[PDB]
Design a binder for these strands. Structure first.
Lengths: 141, 180, 62, 262, 56
RNA sequence: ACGGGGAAUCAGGGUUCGAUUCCGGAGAGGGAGCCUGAGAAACGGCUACCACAUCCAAGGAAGGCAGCAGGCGCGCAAAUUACCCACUCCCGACCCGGGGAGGUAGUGACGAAAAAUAACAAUACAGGACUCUUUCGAGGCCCUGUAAUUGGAAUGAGUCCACUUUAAAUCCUUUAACGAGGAUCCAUUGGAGGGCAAGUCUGGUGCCAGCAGCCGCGGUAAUUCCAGCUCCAAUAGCGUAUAUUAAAGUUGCUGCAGUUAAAAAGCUCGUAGUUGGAUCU
């Protein structure tokens, strides 16, 4: 049972803040060891420079080749594999290009089919991928 | 430092569940019945009702000889009689909880222009207000969600500069007179 | 709507009282006070240049 | 900071000056004078805001610079001179006379007064000390020091000052049964008879006051100003008689006073 | 894997051009149109097929 | 981590944010020491040292934008080297001078408020409804439109004289004159398997390209990809990413659990803590 006195608030307030630490949603946002491990550092987006186009394989029950891009981030030098989303969207990218990268949507976890990929390309060469895919703009060289 | 006020306030709340049939259906019936433009004009009148229910529901926990309930509760019913939503014999604080959205939507200037017969449809009232043909006691009112008070219901008319009440014809009639 | 117009208005006793007690911009609309023709940035340059110069060569500068 | 402040922001002004939000960043910042800056009304607010004589803070300069304004019978050419409680403002070019008395709602008021009354004011005695070859002094709440006072004047009483000469004419003492005005707190501007004074040695005296309708209230002792001996005020009173109406009957007064129209 | 097929079906698709129709409706008159479609003069007809955009 | 006043969310309890215009603190590249003065350990004052760095005739001289603008760098990430002391106030010997304080414009889909993108009438329908005919079918009685059918009446958005506004301008308000029939003066952003409103329609591809937050879809009939049509939702706004709050009675004081799902210490003694039986007018 729980303690239930009237002078027991120090037992109550301090049992909770030790028991709060077994909460993995609490710990991953308060310990600080998973924000120095995050490649962004707690930003929504980041920019980088494309090293190469590595295309990685889908997971078990369904087969395709997810076309990704190996990015090296500007602000801390870290490296990142980001997913180039729609079809024919690797054909707007060459090597050594500057790419704004987002998260995939699961807040630092992989999104189902793709293994170990937590980011997706947003803009290439300071123009948007939705502007290139839908033909609204032209790829600047 | 600036001499500006940053005090603003949102006037609507969006629902918790976005795709819910018979919420969609009921609000579409209230859009079509009263000539409104989008859902946000129903969510706005749902919000001023939810402020009035909530303030009366707070005042119902204080007892009948409270100071605050007797003052602020009589000033809540006074406004609801004044805009014509409540009647006069129903001024206990518990016929507030029997009010609905339609009581508040019947008091807009749009439906009152339709009710008095200055229009011939509920969408004909929206344009006749918005084209500046409608005045209230002296003043051209250009806003359809102008809640008509009870004393200003007897003075709603046709705006003495307009082709409908005043008489100087518009853009179209004069050009056809030029081509006569 | 366009039927009324509100303003202020003041009726003085004479012209000298309405030349002393009145703001200059509301006399300049009557042709009675004429502001000069300096920009604000000309005056601050001319002010800060004679800061660099002692006694009677300050009236020479500008 | 390093040394004293010379500006006043507008939102940080006293509430009873009733300055609106959107006219500027700054408020008039009263000059040092007889009154605390929280307890005063500057002369720029009395001319521009209350009386509507001026229209800008340059016309108050143009009015005060013609030496048309006497505050306690001395001509004042500072527009931020702090006028406070029981101060007489004589404007002789028009012929009016005002006294700054609080009204029932915790603010000052435009209280026009007769020039037969404007020759005197009351002050409250604040400290009495001897010195300088045994000569006794007063210090009032206007910092007016009046040496050689009456020996029956003590602390917290009320004198009556003649304003052309500076001398005391007659006084009221602190007792029960005396008519008092509250000059601070949440009962400010209220007029009632002193019922009781509870002593708290090493802390503040509490002075229970009784209305002319029966509404009892209390204050600390420093917010107490003896106005009359008995029940007769030695100064005039505003349109309301220092008697605070509750908001219900304050509403009833409006919704019954509009029915005299036609 | 092999990157050579990228945009295969996007470039393989037969290019059909969009057919010109009228300007739809906007705003309050659109809400009036879809209220008139569903509520006033609803059809006394084959009910329980209440699936607008029913193909067959 | 500058602290408060406060802000977001919220049944009740809570949780998280608070650099940011008000109050209080601190600091002017980093430490240190002073002069003057009522007040400064002052940086739009001085003297050193450490760090940068400007001119130089090489002997010397001068620096401090976390003021307003502006520039570079950094980065996901943020406006004009504009006008004025007219307002609000401050300083001075001062009714007069000054103020990048402050005000006014410019940029600005941060965000919040109002709110257009059409209304009406006459016809006709192999449309519906109301009165009669057993039924065919008889009507201005009420409604509807995949009528790009006809028809005038109404109007802003723009274009633009004038007034008004203001320091002077702008903007809005007020008014001339022009200003709508595919009223081309075209409304977009996401979606149509389920969660979750809305097509197992047609063409293409054939575990490929790709979609999909999750479940799943695609191997030759794909309700899911690429498109055409049609439909849906919000609507001058709508997607995405990340922080956070509710949902979370999945942190539990209210209010969880502990035989078998994660979990009761091997047992007992024991100080602090926590909790302690009747009884007095």
């Amino acid at each position: 049972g729980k303690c239930r006195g009237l002078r027991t608030a120090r037992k109550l307030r301090s049992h909770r803040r030790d028991q709060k630490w077994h909460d993995k949603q609490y710990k991953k946002a308060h310990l600080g060891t998973a924000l120095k491990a995050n490649p962004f550092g707690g930003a929504s987006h980041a920019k980088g420079i494309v090293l190469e186009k590595v295309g990685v394989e889908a997971k078990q029950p369904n087969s395709a080749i997810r076309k990704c891009v190996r990015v090296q981030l500007i602000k801390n030098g870290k490296k990142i594999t980001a997913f180039v989303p729609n079809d024919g969207c690797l054909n707007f990218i060459e090597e050594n290009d500057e790419v704004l990268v987002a998260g995939f949507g699961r807040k630092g976890h992989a999104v189902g089919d793709i293994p170990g990929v937590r980011f997706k390309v947003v803009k290439v060469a300071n123009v948007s991928l939705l502007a290139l895919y839908k033909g609204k703009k032209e790829r600047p060289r | 430092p600036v001499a500006r006020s940053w005090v603003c306030r949102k006037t609507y709340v969006t629902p918790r569940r976005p795709f819910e049939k018979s919420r969609l259906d009921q609000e579409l019936k209230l859009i079509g019945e009263y000539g409104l433009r989008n859902k946000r004009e129903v969510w706005r009148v749902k919000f001023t009702l939810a402020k009035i229910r909530k303030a009366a529901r707070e005042l119902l926990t204080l007892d009948e000889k409270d100071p605050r309930r007797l003052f602020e509760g009589n000033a809540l019913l006074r406004r609801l009689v004044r805009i014509g939503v409540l009647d006069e014999g129903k001024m206990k604080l518990d016929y507030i909880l029997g009010l609905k959205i339609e009581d508040f939507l019947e008091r807009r200037l749009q439906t009152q222009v339709f009710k008095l017969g200055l229009a011939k449809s509920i969408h004909h009232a929206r344009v006749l207000i918005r084209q500046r043909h409608i005045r209230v006691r002296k003043q051209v009112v250009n806003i359809p969600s102008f809640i008509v008070r009870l004393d200003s219901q007897k003075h709603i008319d046709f705006s003495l500069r307009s082709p409908y009440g005043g008489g100087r014809p518009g853009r179209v009639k004069r050009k056809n007179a030029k081509k006569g | 709507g366009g039927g009324k117009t509100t303003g202020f208005g003041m009726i003085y006793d004479s012209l000298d009282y309405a030349k002393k007690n009145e703001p200059k911009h509301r006399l300049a609309r009557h042709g009675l006070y004429e502001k000069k023709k300096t920009s604000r940035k000309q005056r601050k340059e001319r002010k800060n240049r004679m800061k660099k110069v002692r006694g009677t060569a300050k009236a020479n500068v500008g | 900071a390093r040394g004293p402040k010379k500006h006043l922001k507008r939102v940080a002004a006293p509430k009873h000056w009733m300055l609106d939000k959107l006219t500027g960043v700054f408020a008039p910042r009263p000059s040092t004078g007889p009154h605390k800056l929280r307890e005063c009304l500057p002369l720029i607010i009395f001319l521009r805001n209350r009386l509507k004589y001026a229209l800008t803070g340059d016309e108050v300069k143009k009015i005060c610079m013609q030496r048309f304004i006497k505050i306690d019978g001395k001509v004042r050419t500072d527009i931020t001179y702090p006028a406070g409680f029981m101060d007489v403002i004589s404007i002789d070019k028009t012929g009016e006379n005002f006294r700054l008395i609080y009204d029932t709602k915790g603010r000052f008021a435009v209280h026009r007064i007769t020039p037969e009354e404007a020759k005197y004011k009351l002050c409250k005695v604040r400290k009495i000390f001897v010195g300088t070859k045994g000569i006794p002094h007063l210090v009032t709440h206007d910092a007016r020091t009046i040496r050689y006072p009456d020996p029956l004047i003590k602390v917290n009483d009320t004198i009556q000052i003649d304003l052309e000469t500076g001398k005391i004419t007659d006084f009221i003492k602190f007792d029960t049964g005396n008519l008092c005005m509250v000059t601070g707190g949440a009962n400010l501007g209220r007029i009632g008879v002193i019922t009781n004074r509870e002593r708290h040695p090493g802390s503040f005296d509490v002075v229970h006051v009784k209305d002319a309708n029966g509404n009892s209230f209390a204050t600390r002792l420093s917010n107490i100003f003896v106005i009359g001996k008995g029940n007769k005020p030695w100064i005039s009173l505003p349109r309301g008689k220092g008697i605070r109406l509750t908001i219900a009957e304050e509403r009833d007064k409006r919704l019954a006073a509009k029915q005299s129209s036609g | 894997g092999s990157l050579a097929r990228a945009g295969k079906v996007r470039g393989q698709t037969p290019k059909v051009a969009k057919q010109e129709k009228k300007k739809k409706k906007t705003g309050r008159a659109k809400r009036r149109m879809q209220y008139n479609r569903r509520f006033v003069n609803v059809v006394p007809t084959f009910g329980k097929k209440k699936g607008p955009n029913a193909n067959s």
